[PDB]
Amino acid sequence: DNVFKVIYINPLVDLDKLFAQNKKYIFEESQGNESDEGILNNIKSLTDQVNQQIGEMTIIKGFQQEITSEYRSLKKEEVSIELKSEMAIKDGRRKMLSYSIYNYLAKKKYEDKIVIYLIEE
Amino acid sequence: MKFSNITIKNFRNFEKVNINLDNKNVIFGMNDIGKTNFLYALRFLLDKEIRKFGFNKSDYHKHDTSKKIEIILTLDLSNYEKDEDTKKLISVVKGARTSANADVFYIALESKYDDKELYGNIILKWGSELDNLIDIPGRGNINALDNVFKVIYINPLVDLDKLFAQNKKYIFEESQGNESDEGILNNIKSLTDQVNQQIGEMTIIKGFQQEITKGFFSDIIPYIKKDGDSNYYPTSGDGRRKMLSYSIYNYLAKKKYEDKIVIYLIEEPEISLHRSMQIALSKQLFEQSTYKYFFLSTHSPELLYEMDNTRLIRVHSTEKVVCSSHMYNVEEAYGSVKKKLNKALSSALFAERVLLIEGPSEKILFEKVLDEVEPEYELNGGFLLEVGGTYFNHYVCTLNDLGITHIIKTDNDLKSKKGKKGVYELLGLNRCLNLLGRENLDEITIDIPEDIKGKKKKERLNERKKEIFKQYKNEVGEFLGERIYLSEIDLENDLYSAIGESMKRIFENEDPVHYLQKSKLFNMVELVNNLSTKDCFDVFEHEKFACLKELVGSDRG
Amino acid sequence: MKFSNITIKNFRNFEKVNINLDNKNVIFGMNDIGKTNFLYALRFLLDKEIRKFGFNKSDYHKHDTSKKIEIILTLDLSNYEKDEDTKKLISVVKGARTSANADVFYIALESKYDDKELYGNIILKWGSELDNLIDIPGRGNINALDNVFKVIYINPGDGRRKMLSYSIYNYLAKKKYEDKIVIYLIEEPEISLHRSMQIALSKQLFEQSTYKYFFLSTHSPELLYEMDNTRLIRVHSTEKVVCSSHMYNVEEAYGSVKKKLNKALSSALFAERVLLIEGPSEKILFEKVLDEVEPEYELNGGFLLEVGGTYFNHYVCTLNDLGITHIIKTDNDLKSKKGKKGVYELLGLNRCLNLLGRENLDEITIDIPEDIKGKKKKERLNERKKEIFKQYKNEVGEFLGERIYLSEIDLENDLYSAIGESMKRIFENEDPVHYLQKSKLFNMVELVNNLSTKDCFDVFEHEKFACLKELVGSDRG
């Protein structure tokens, strides 16, 4: 397992199930590569706080107050309800996007491993 | 506006049933008896998400399709001048009401099978007369009952993600003008213009893209944050994940569906909840105005700790599946003792045969005798209910309207009334005659001299109890016809009539009846701690203890 | 043969947890206090289908991933040539045991984070000493721990399918697993089940020999109606997660009243503060006062428990080992002896002294004329009870430090000290306290039908009813 990495490519899977792993692989990019994205890491926290003042529109700020006020009529528990999304932007263009996603992840992550592609149909 | 009746014909295990209802309804019963099939008849009648799929072969009674399915719901509209829900009904059904003061309304469902299509079509009708129902008008996938009724169904297997996603079309999807923060949204747009042109680090992913050459509220996830911690764990337990879904349904009912009539169909809300959360949910169900119309199914007595103004429906089996209903109100005279009667009666609602005893010493002695004789009596539906001495009307009418067998074992008491000496009040006979609906008897005068005091006063009162029990023999036989077992003097004299040789052997006294009644609770534990197997069978097989033989349900006596 | 201890050094919501166990363990607690996380610590240690996926970031305490997850389980193994499961362990352990320590065993789990592959590897070790633990030998996907323990995890029209799944699981455990040690892990068996079936499952769970080893998480009191020879684990709802254990046994003296005891305590196990009252008249009066003053006392963790004709030790030991606050309100009595005249034993003071850890006092005798007697014998015994309460004062202060509230005569004289003008108004008699003694179940209902607001606050704010302020728990500091 320390030498071989097998990438299995099937067109029946979509971009969402690889994209859910890519939500933590973005954090692997920001931590890795001997802090090459450390020039961007102070201003990727600027993009992280772009997702902080989406919490102060009043359609979200009304929900954050009224759900907690509906929840605290049972036992007055010491809870809080928060909301977060954490998205990112980039049956043939999804597949051609996922081919470049697999080639990009093979170029970044697996420089120390032998990569074997199993491309089925 | 009030629900009055439902009548279900040929739907699943119901062949022909008729159940009176109210706004707040609680359904309870055994397993595989049809509590979920009762709630799905309301889902096929009033919820449009199940009605569009039609009926299969398995929705018919004993799987044959030669009988039609007919479900009729009756509403009462006698409070049109004060309630706004009645106007919400009448403003959609503006042509089908017949008389000028029609206070009833009927919403019906009929279904006949198609063997070539193998399909069960559902045709809905409404009106004010039962023989003159007209078809509901509709255009496309929408008829006119969807403009009046919103049905919220809460299953036991809620998933917070799924519910939030499906409802995220209602919240977070409004324009609302400007909301006084548009330059903050311009700063959202301006800081996205300094990230799309310089994402290359030191030209490692800009060069990777060189070689080949807004509304982001879709994936928002609600979390529960405890105070004092800042982390966001995705794994949460099923206690708070249920109650956040209940809060989201309450918020969507109080915001998006203010124009409609909201009906809750809740299946088993005690699942993965604590006891105190069940008591808090019971108080919010039966006191506050959040749930005005609900139909509740449950298996837990802790959700019935706060019940008032409630139709209780019990589904059971005698020959077929039959549902017995009862309208539950606590009176003004029981308003100070309401919580103790609710905590007593809420466990006795889930039984088959209930023995109503008068204190804890009877519970100690009867639990010893049923521990030694029939130890699986509560597996088979038996229950012992502590009344408290005074409350025989409320328990017997609540258990008798639901089809639960009530058994009463009680004493013959004399009450010393307030302010007068020598004139005493008949108590146990007055309670058992008020159980039959008759008038209370007049008070009696007992001449006790002042020098006679102590055991001889108790002996004269016991001889007067023997004389009064001898006088009313036909009333005692009329009580014994209706499973009321009045003792002659006390419980301990009937216990001395059965095992009195062993009571003289254990207590080492010439008067073991008086030593049992000197301290009632601690000497009963001493009698229970020295009883044998033969003495418990001598109590159980006796004539004077037939209430235990009625409680075990056998035909031995 | 027997489990002894589990030491969860680090997991999700456990920072340092050490729990004494047994066979037949039952774990209860509040909502979101890691009752499930405890059952996943047994699944990650013993079951292989959970252990084959490793540990994520979220399985560490406060998402730290710099500390080591360690779960250590202790087995007893004290006997030989009677128990067959001990030979089933000794056969696979082989030379991992030492004669000097041949009656203890340890199975440990270690996990350290990688932070490059973002994966948590699980290394299992077994040994007869806590130092020098060696690794479990394994061939392919199977190590040698899977040749000993088989773990059955249960998590559920409806109702009868769950009982049919119980019959399928018990039939597979009886048929296919004769050569293995079977551990059942049951997650909430009160779900979609009638209460008669809950009492039947409790009788089968605590009486039959088919469930030799289980860990049971529950929310229902009706699954604890038959509990005997069991271990009770409670997870406390404080800001630090504390787990408390009690070894529950019912003695030979309490075997004739076992049913009542179990039923009553089964609902009192799910509380936070339990007030132990004597009878139903105290239940009528305290339910009226706690309805008129603090009606959400049952929501916040209060409970009223009627204990009659019992020496208080079973309830106080069971609720004290589990970390539940117990408050006792009681009155002193003078019980006459059988076959003896004029000799009274001091019953309530002996109950409170046996709770404190002392011995029973001597039997007092009185020279009352007896030949001439009447209502005035009750005032003579009340004067003797006042002299008993005057003589023992530092013992009453020692009871008052341990949340035991002994009355001077009765509850009724303490009620007459607070609202006695209202008792003179309602009962219209010169002796209202003597009138309620004639029929306790009837005149208490007649009393609480006629009290209102500012009588219940005068009961609640009185210094002779401080047990209600202990049960509510509103502290001034």
Ligand SMILES: Nc1ncnc2c1ncn2[C@@H]1O[C@H](COP(=O)(O)OP(=O)(O)OP(=O)(O)O)[C@@H](O)[C@H]1O
């Ligand atoms: N409501 C809409 N408004 C505008 N564009 C839309 C809308 N719905 C879909 N689209 C566009 O149409 C596309 C749908 O592609 P579609 O699946 O029809 O292509 P295709 O030729 O069948 O694909 P393939 O050859 O890969 O199977 C979406 O990717 C999107 O760009």
Ligand SMILES: Nc1ncnc2c1ncn2[C@@H]1O[C@H](COP(=O)(O)OP(=O)(O)OP(=O)(O)O)[C@@H](O)[C@H]1O
């Ligand atoms: N079409 C049908 N014809 C006859 N009987 C049926 C039909 N469909 C279901 N049943 C009966 O109804 C039972 C299921 O009832 P249901 O699931 O409503 O019970 P329940 O009271 O909700 O149960 P629980 O409380 O244990 O979950 C089946 O076991 C069967 O006996």
Ligand SMILES: Nc1ncnc2c1ncn2[C@@H]1O[C@H](COP(=O)(O)OP(=O)(O)OP(=O)(O)O)[C@@H](O)[C@H]1O
């Ligand atoms: N890695 C972790 N670090 C810290 N706290 C965690 C971690 N994982 C889970 N938790 C916390 O542990 C609790 C998880 O709830 P859990 O399912 O263990 O409780 P429960 O008592 O079984 O609940 P329920 O009554 O709903 O079944 C939550 O409070 C959650 O925040």
Ligand SMILES: [Mg+2]
């Ligand atoms: Mg069901």
Ligand SMILES: [Mg+2]
């Ligand atoms: Mg849980």
